[PDB]
Amino acid sequence: SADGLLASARAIKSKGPAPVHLWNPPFNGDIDMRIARDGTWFYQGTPINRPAMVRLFSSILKREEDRFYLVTPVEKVGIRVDDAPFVAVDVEVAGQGRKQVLTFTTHVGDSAVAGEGNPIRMAQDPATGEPAPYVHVRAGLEALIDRKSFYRLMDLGEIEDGWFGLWSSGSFFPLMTVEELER
């Protein structure tokens, strides 16, 4: 129907994240694309080991309600996202204590400064029931924070009014109860 993976990638050009909320093209169907929980894109069930192309398609990700699309000015297609569209693979701290700022980098190279504009959210693992936290990157597209980055964040956490969590950019993001941290 009737332009494929590589052809579609050749039609896109991006210097960066596209202003997809300017665009409301008609829906052309769902494609067999799935962003796995670990950030891997699958096409027709086969992974794409191709970070350039993953960055290119990621530039045109758009969230509507709870679903995800790839959107250009002329076309919109639905994709499947298992969990978050991105994985946060790095976190950088600056400053100290309650004044600290956390800058995250995602697996496609985007940067998100944690704070009110890009909040950190606590969720639990569907599977484990263990804490799985996210950070907002843009326009409702969130990054799941990976193990390596999570464990470094534990060491930069703080307690305020019953909750263990993270200060970034002057705002406090609860992650779990004190009770929970103590377990």
Numbering used by the authors: 10 to 192
Reproduce, without paraphrasing, sentences from the article in which this PDB structure was first reported:
The SPO0140 gene of Silicibacter pomeroyi DSS-­3, a marine α-proteobacterium, encodes a protein with a molecular weight of 21.2 kDa (residues 1–193) and a calculated iso­electric point of 5.7. The crystal structure of SPO0140 was determined to 2.5 Å resolution using the MAD method. The final model included two protomers (residues 10–192 for chain A, residues 10–193 for chain B), one glycerol molecule and 186 water molecules in the asymmetric unit. SPO0140 is an α/β protein comprising two domains. The N-­terminal domain (residues 10–93) consists of a β-meander–α-­helix–β-meander core (residues 24–92), with the two β-meanders hydrogen bonding along the first and sixth strands to form a twisted mixed six-stranded β-sheet. Two N-terminal helices (H1 and H2) pack against the sheet and complete this domain. SPO0140 crystallized with two monomers (A and B) in the asymmetric unit. The largest packing interface buries ∼810 Å2 of solvent-accessible surface per monomer and involves mainly helix H1, strand β1 and the H3–β4 loop from the N-terminal domain and helix H4 and strands β14–β15 from the C-terminal domain. However, packing analysis using PISA suggests that this would not be a stable dimerization interface. The results of analytical size-exclusion chromatography (anSEC) support the assignment of a monomer as the quaternary state in solution for SPO0140.
